[PDB]
Amino acid sequence: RGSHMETWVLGRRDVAEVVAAVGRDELMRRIIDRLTGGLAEIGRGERHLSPLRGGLERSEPVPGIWEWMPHREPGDHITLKTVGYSPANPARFGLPTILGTVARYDDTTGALTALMDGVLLTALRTGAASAVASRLLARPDSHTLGLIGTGAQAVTQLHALSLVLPLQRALVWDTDPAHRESFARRAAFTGVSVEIAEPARIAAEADVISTATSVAVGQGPVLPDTGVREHLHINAVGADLVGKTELPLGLLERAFVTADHPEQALREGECQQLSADRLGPQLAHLCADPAAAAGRQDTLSVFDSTGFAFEDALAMEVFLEAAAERDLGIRVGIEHHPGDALDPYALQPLPLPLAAP
């Protein structure tokens, strides 16, 4: 742990190479497996939920939030995801709405040991979480997926869920016609047929639904309370600003609701709409004991998804394992570790030339 040590940086090209080498399906399966196992450890009391995430809300050019998401594994390392939600990014800047990075700090010394992209990782672990929850709460013969919001998360929602359920078709809606019209192309690699459908038809026909929209505060719901199939399972994934919800209260009030992180869901999930005592067991509890969801595949269920840093730490480990196996990334001395630990000015600039000019 001496001063010599440096930070392992995985850039955009290294993350691409992991995907190419491992393959999209297998990478996602790995992340599903890792999350499943980690959530079960939480459910058994072996590990703790992450502290509540925090952020700085920004009103322009459309309201969004930039957040910090710490998770400590005592004695090992601290993970921090720094992540923005800026829902004008695609149309104004050609950038994703969700832009972030994930860092690892040594628990013992506090040294920054690794840093990587958070955009891909976030999309993957968020799809994976919906898959963990849906494998438990959706009918195992579910064939039709509904998606409300067909932006970036929708892509990994469909992908992840196609890996745990025998999906054959997706019925999809977005309030931006261009975004719903491009979804078939973005979704084609999954082999799942895509059709555009209005929310009322999605509600009526889907076996499982994911909502993942940039709906503004107080502008929900995004799925009307219009008649749904009895066994419907919904992943409510949209999460950013306090005040943002996507599901109608009438539906939520008659569902079995599992939150990823109950205290956080009550603040910024659909559980904003509910009292604490109406919540079913949390996702970690279901992972430790799937029968705590007994019977809930045949009745209305909702997985309230907010995202928490433990999920990022687990996904990051999957990337760092595959990247280490292929020798990827670079090492950069970012942090100053002075030769004399008590002398901040003990720096080492490049030596000066000796020869006469």
Place this chain on the structure above:
Amino acid sequence: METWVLGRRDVAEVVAAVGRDELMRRIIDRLTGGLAEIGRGERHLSPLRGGLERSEPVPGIWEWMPHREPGDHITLKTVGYSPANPARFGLPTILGTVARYDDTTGALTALMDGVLLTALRTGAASAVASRLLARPDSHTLGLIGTGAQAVTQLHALSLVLPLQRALVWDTDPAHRESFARRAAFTGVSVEIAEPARIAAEADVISTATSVAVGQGPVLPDTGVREHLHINAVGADLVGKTELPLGLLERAFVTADHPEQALREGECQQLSADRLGPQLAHLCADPAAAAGRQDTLSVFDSTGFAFEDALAMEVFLEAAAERDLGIRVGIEHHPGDALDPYALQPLP
């Protein structure tokens, strides 16, 4: 767009090209101007920092410190306090990094060392406060704690006050005995002296210790020169203080960040209504300080992220001028913003 990364080597090169005094002055100047802007209501204090307490190896904390300049950028310092680092690992107790994110898009635009930058802006803040609240003819500086921050407390204060000597103490004999050579570059003579003597002879003191919660105080509850000014710089865990209560309770106290001070500063010992005007208020109206040079004063320093934003800008200006640093594509920006898998080209 890619992230501009300034590592230890680039930071060393800034110091070598600009020089230590000049770099410190720039930071003093930027902070003085920034704090005065806060004091006029043109800018605002950072939100309260947060952290994760760590019990081992000895109690420490790893913290996150955000600051937003709306429409411009967001700064985040991530910083550990791990006071076994020097002796166990040869690492500084304070280890961190500073990142900048575009406010509009969220994108990570710059990343740099936080170790040097922390020590500089922390010295600078004491200099800002001391120029206001110490006697202008102050000749004797006292330092309690002679580790990393002491070096920049001395340097910064030597630039703003006519200091002739530093009386110093550390509970680790090796740490006090090495201080004269770490300080030599400042031209201020160093003498090792016990806390009772430092308390009684200093014109200005900075306390900057890794004292544990429940340990200390680091000066005795004694009589002091009437005009004594103290910078209380140690700050880490909730619970941690350095000064005796009887000294604090008869001082005029200014905090860098009053809410933060009340939680993790000397002001943890005081009720909220005993804090006086904050540092930014004095910076915008130096006349409010001028009567308090001749009676006991304390600057309660915790550090806040605005200071890190300002110091980082100084470094980025100097680095751009010499085109230092590298560019790394860290964040994935997919060719289609709505397609996370659009990673093309595959390697």
